[PDB]
Write a protein that binds this DNA or RNA. Sequence first.
RNA 1: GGCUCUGUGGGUGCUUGGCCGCUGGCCAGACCUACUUCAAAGCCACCGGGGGUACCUACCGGUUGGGGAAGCCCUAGCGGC
RNA 2: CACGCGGGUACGCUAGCCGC
Lengths: 445, 137, 58, 173, 479
Amino acid sequence: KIKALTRSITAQQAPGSDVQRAPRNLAPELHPFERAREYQRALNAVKLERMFAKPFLGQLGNGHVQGVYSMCKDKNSLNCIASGSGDGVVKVWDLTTRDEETWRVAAHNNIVKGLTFTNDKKLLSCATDGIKLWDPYASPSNTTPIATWQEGGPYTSLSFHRSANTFAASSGQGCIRIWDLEHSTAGQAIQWPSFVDTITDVCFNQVETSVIGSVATDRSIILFDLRTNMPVIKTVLHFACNRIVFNPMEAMNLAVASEDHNIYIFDARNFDKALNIQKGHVAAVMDVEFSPTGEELVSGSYDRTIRLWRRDAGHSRDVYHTKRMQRVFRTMWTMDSKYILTGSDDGNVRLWRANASERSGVKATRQRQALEYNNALLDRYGHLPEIRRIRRHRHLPKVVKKATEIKREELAAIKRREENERKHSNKKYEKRKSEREKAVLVKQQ
Amino acid sequence: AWVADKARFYLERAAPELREWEEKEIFTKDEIRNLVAKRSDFEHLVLAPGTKPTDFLNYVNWERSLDRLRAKRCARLNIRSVTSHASQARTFGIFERAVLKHPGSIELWLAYLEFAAQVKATKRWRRIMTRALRLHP
Amino acid sequence: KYLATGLPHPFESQQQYERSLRLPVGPEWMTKETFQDATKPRVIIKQGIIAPMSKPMY
Amino acid sequence: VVNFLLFESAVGFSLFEVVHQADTVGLELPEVKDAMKTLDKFGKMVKLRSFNPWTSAAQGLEAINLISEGIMPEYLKSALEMNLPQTSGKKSKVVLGVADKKLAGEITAAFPGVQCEAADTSEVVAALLRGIRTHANKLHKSLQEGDIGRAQLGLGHAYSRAKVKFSVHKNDN
Amino acid sequence: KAELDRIRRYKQAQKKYGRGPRVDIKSVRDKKLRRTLTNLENKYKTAALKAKEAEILLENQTGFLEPEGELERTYKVRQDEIVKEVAVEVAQKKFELKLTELGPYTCEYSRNGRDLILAGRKGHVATMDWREGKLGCELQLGETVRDARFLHNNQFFAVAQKKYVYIYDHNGVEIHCLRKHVEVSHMEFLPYHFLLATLSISGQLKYQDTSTGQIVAEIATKHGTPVSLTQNPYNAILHIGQQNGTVTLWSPNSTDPLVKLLAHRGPVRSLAVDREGRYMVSTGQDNKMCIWDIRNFKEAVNSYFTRAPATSVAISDTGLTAVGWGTHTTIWKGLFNKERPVQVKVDSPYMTWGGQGQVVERVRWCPFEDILGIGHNEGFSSIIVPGAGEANYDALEVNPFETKKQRQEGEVKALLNKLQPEMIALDPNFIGNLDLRSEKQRQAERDLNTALKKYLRKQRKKNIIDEKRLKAEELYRQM
RNA sequence: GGCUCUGUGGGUGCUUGGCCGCUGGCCAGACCUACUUCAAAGCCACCGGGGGUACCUACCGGUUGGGGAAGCCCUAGCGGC
RNA sequence: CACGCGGGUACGCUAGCCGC
C-alpha cells in the first residue's frame, strides 16, 4: 500500500488567480526559538520606537509677546483653544488653521490669570482687574466685552460647569463665588468660614456635577458642594499646591500639582492617604491635566519640561523639552486624547503629541497589527536589561540632568539621616509609615 | 493582496464545525479534507481583487447546499445535536461582504433577500430591504 | 544579560512569573484569531470628542 | 464629528456614511495627507450609503440650475428624507457634511434635526469631501453605469447653453 | 459521558501546544494578581485549544507504505515497485546523476529543498534546481573540496577548499575567501542565528557571523582532531564527535564542552539529531549505533549494530532515519517515538537501498519531499521513500515554492530577527527567567561541630587573623 | 561524388569475473537487531606587515565561599594532619 | 423560551395536539 506525498504548485497558486496561497502549520517543531525570536523582535521594537519618537508637531501662530500664563480649551468643540498672555492680550485659536489667530483682544492691564469657555460659545477671562466676558465668534468682530465683574476681590481662576451656564471664580479673599449666567449679577460667595489665604485654583468636577475642588496657599485643598452651598472638607498638605484637577472618567479621583515637585492622586471620599504619588520633576509642577480618557496625565513644570504619565505609573512615561521653550505654565490635552498643548513663558503655545512614536491617520491592517504586536511584545519583555535601558534612555537638558542628580543625592542623604535616627532613637519600635500616608499632614472638617 | 492572511480567519472560524462533524460519524476524514479544500478555494476566490457577483453566488450556493446535504445526512444517521446555526451565520457573512463589495448588483441583492426570507429572518429581511432600497431607489 | 534581574512589580513568585509568560505572542506560533485577541490593546481610543461620562453605566 | 455627508456629481448625488472619522488636529500632517491620497486608506473612512441618479438630462440641468443658485431640489429633499434618521434636534442630532453653505442652511431649515457642516467653513469636511472627489470614480464603480467623463461633458454643455441662450442666436454654420 | 471527548481534547492540546505545565491560580494571594492571572490562564487555554482545533485545515497527507500479507515485509520493496505504484510528479524525482571522474560526491540541499549543491572530492562543485532540472552553477575549482554547504538562501554557498573556505554567489562568482578558517574539514550553518561554524582539522571551531562578517568565538576543542559534526536544530548547539569516542556539545559562549556524552569505543563516525531536539543517533567505528534522549541526557535503548562503520546518518522530518554504511544505506522507521516514555528496539529496517558497488559518502533528506539523496563515488542518486518528509510546511518559516518577492521579504525579515550568538544554551527558552542570585541580593538590600574544624584548617593558612576566626577559636575551645 | 558537423564501439600502459553484511554465498536473494566488561596515554597542528588594547577569549599568578581523589598517622573513628 | 423528520386540526402557505 504505497503512497507518497505529492505537492502540486496548486498549493501555492491555484491556476487563474494572483493570490499567493500561504498554507500554515502551527506545530512547534516547525518554529524554533520562540522566546528568543520574540526577544529579538521586542528589542527591534524598542529601537524602532526610540528612532521614530518625534513628538514635536507645531506651534500655534506667531505666539504671544510675553509669556502664556493662562490657556483653556473648549470642552464641547474640538478645535477651539484660547490663550491669555502676560501683557493682558487674549487670543482665540482654531486648531485646524494654525497659521494665524482667529480673534485677539487687548483684554486687561495685568497678566491673564484664569480663562475659560462658556458652554454656549463665549469666553471668560480673569485678571486682577476683574473678570470679563467676550463673544469671539460673531459676524462682526467685537473687541469690547459684553459683561464685566469687579466686585469680589482679586480673582485668580475660572471654572465652567459641564452642562448649565454656571461658573465659579476663585478669588483672592479666600472665597470662591458662583455665578449663573443670564439671571445672576453678583453671584453667591462660598467660603470656608474663617479663611484668609488666597484660593489659587478652582475646578468643577465634570463627571459629578456640583462638586467643586480648590487649592489654597495654606498648603490646603478644600471641597465644595454646590447643592448645599457650603464647604465640605479641608486638608492641609506639607507643601503648597499649584493646581487641582479631577478625573474625567472616575468622579472621585483628583490630582494636585504641588511645589513638592509632585503630583498627588487623591480620593475625594477618603483624604487619609494619596492613591498615587507621581514623582519625577526637578522644579515645581505648574500645571497638571488628566487625559479625557482619564488614564494619563500631562504636567508642565517650572523647569523646562513636560512629563507624560500613566495613571498607575508613579514615574515618567515621557519627558518633552526644547531649548526654545523657556518655562512651562499651562499644559492641556486636546479632546482627541492624542495631542497635548503647552503654553510656555516664551509666549509660545506648542502642540506636541502624546504617544510620541505613534503616527495618526488611517492605518492599514498589517500596519496597525505590527504596531499593536510591538506594543504587546514590549508589555511582556519590557523589563529585561537591554530592552529596559534602551526604552528608558531619554536625552534631558544639562540643567535638568544636573539638578536631578543633585536631587537624588539630597534625597538619599535625607533617607540615610532618617534611617540612622530610626535605628538609634526610640522610633525603632514602630511600624514604618508609608509614603502615601506621609503625603498628608492633617485633615479637618 | 493580503488574501492568504485575510482568508485565514474565515477558515479558522469554519474549523470547529468540521471538528464536530469529524467527532460525530457524519462526514468521514477524506470528505472533510475535500470540504476544507473546497472552502479554501472558494475563500481565496472570494477575497481576491478582481471578483464578481456570480463568484459570490457560487460560494453562497455551495455553502447552502452543504447545509442541505448535512441536514439530509443528519436525519439519516439520526442525530439531533448538530445545528445549522453556524452555517447560516457564515452564509450571512458571505452575503454581507458580498453586498459590501458589489452594492450595485440587484441580482445579488435579490438573492440575499431570497435567502433571508427563506431561512425565516423577517427583521433581518427588513433591514436588508432598507439597505437595498437606499442603494437602488 | 538575557536573564531578568528581578521580579516584575505585580508578580510574587518565580514560578508565577516564569510560568505566566510561557507562550509566544507572535503569528508564527498562534492562530490568527488568537493573535488578534492577544494583541488587542487595553484602551481602544477612536477619534472624536472624548467627553467625560454623563451618567453611571453600571 | 461627522455622521453622513452629501456629494453631488454629474451622474447624480450620493451620500456617504463615515466610519472612523478623520483626525482634525493632524489635518496638515504628512501621514494623514498620504492617507487621504491612497484609496486603500480612505475607503476605510468612507462607506457608500445611498445613491440617487438622475432620470434624465433635463433633471440634471434643473439640478445644477437649482444647486448652483443655492436652492435645494425636491428630490434631494426626498432622498434626505429617505436616508437620514428622522429626528428633531431636541435630544439627538445628525451631522451632515455638505459642500456649500447656502445648501447647508437650507437643509438645516428643511430638517431641524440635521446640523450641516459646510466645506467652505470646516476643514475636516473640506478634506473629507476633497478625498471623495479624488476617488469618486472608484467609490461608485459598482453602480456607475458607463463613465463620468461624457456625463460631465454633456452636462457642462447643457448648463452653459442654458445660462447663455446659445442656440437662439448662434446660426451661422 | 459526552464531555469525555472534551477533556481528552484539552489534555491533548495542553500536551502539544501548551509549552508549559500551567499557572497555579490558587496559590496567588493578591486579588488583582489572582484575577489577571485567571484571565491569562483562560486566554492561554483557549489559545492552545484553538490551535488544536485549527490543525484540521492542514492540506497534505503524510506518505506511508504498509505490508498487506503476513509474508510480505516492508524492506523487500523495490524502487521499481514504488515508482510503478506512486504518482508521476513524485516519480519524476527518482533520478540518478552519473559523474564518475571527479571524486566521491557530497550532497546538501537548501533548507527549503529547492536547490541542491553537490561537491566532488577533486573539485567539481555544482548547484542545481533538481526538480526543474536547471543548474544554477557549475565550477571546477582545481584543488580538493572538503564540504559544500548552502547559506541562508540558495543564493550564497560556501565550499571548504584545501586551505580556506570560500563563499560564492548564485552564478558561482566567488564573493570572498575566509582566511581565518584554515584547513576546514567540517561546516554547519546555523539558520536562525546567521553563524557559520567550521571545525578545522586541528580541532579549532570558529563561528563566523555571515551577515556582519566577524568571527564571534574561536573555541579550541582541546582534545584531538574531530571526526564528525552535526547541529541541533532546536538549540543551535553543535554536537561534534571526537576520536576517543565521546560526542561533545559546544556553544559559542563557553570554551569547555557543555556536556560530553560518552559513546562508542572507537571514534564516532557520524551523528544525527532530531529537528524537535529530542533524540540523537550516533554511529561509531565500533560497529554499533545508538540513540540518546537529549532532553534528559541518557541512552534510550540498547545499541543497534550496523554491519560496517557507517559513513553518514541523517534523520528526516518525521521519525525516519537513513544510516549509510559502506556501499548501501538502510532506513529505519521507529527508532525514537516521542510519545513513549521508554523506547523499544526495532527488529527490522524500514527499507534498504541496494548495494551495487557504489560506496556511500553522504546521505541527506530532501527537507519537504519524500525522497532521499545519496551522494556516492559514482555521483548522485535520489531514491524515493514514502514515509519521510513533513507533509505540511509553514509558509512563514520556510517555503518550498518561494517566489522572488517572497524570498526577498523573507531574507530581510530573517536579517532583522537574526539572533545574537549569546542566546544559545541547552534550553533555548530561558530568555526572561530569574537571575536568582540577583533577586536574592535585591530582596536582601530591600529588607535590610564537623565543619567548624575544617573552617580553621582552611583559615590557618592565610595567616590573616580576622576576628570571625577569633570567635571560631573561642568556640573550638568551648568544644 | 565532395566538404563540414554529429553519434556509437574499439584503441590510445601487460590480457586473472558482477555483487555482498566476502575462508563463504548470491545473482528470483535469505535472515533482519543481536552481543556486551570495566570511557579515553601524552605532544604537535599553516591566518601577510607595523601598531592599539576598552570589551570577549587563551595562558600565568592570586582572592572570597563551598568541595573533597590521593599522601601521612593513630588515641580506632560519623576520626585526626 | 423555541430552532431537526411523521401523521393530525389546516395549504397556490405554515400557526396549533401527540411522536420519531
